[PDB]
Amino acid sequence: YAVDYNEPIIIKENGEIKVVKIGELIDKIIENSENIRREGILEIAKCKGIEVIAFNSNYKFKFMPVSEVSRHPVSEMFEIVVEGNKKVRVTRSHSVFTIRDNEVVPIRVDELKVGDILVLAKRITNIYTNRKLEKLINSDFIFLKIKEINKVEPTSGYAYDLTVPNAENFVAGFGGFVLHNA
């Protein structure tokens, strides 16, 4: 999911609710864990008693268990800015619904161009997903032109991951973007 540090997530920790920067939570978890393993640049900690808002297999937005968290160093992220000054910061390997040749299709963020028309969900929060759930969530959609595409530095120098079983998505950040792993 390689999410930037600053993206707020809504969580339950050891049984209670709070709203926090995803990077802040995950840093605290890892730095307190004795269950860290590595996959190259990837630092992975398994965790207990943490739940995040996600869209589950029964088609509902609910608190769902996080099994593990992880982080890895990243050099660059793309900031996409659309009409109304909505914006999102994501790594290169993400794709977003774009109008291309008369259809809505997922396009990698590094292949996007100013003037491209993105399809955003009509909601306050972004969704980071590993599977297709647009049209499967009960949402209205809005069409917004890209204004800027900037290359920026990650807030921490790291990007972050949650593992959410039986959902493989989670809610994080604001705007109404749906970001697909790619």
Query: Residues 16, 34, 101, 140: which binds ligand NH4 (CB under 6 A)?
Result: 101
Considering only residues 65 through 94, tell me which ones interact with ligand NH4, judged by CB under 6 A: 65, 91-93
**Long-range pairs for 59-62: beta carbons < 8 A, 24 or more residues apart:** 59/136, 59/137, 61/171
Could you tell me the CA-to-CA distances from 61 to 54, 137, 149, 170 in Å, in that order?
5, 9, 30, 9
Length of the chain: 182
Angle, CA of 64, 65 and 67, to the nearest 5°: 145
Minimum CB separation from ligand NH4 for residue 99, in Å? 5
Binding part of the chain for ligand NH4, among 3-11, 18-26, 119-127, 159-167 by CB under 6 A, reads 159-167
Residue nearest to ligand NH4 (CB): 93
Q: Which is nearer to ligand NH4, 46 or 100 (CB)?
A: 100
Residue position matching structure tokens 């800027």: 148
- Contact residues: ligand NH4, CB under 6 A: 64-65, 91-93, 99-102, 107, 111, 164-167
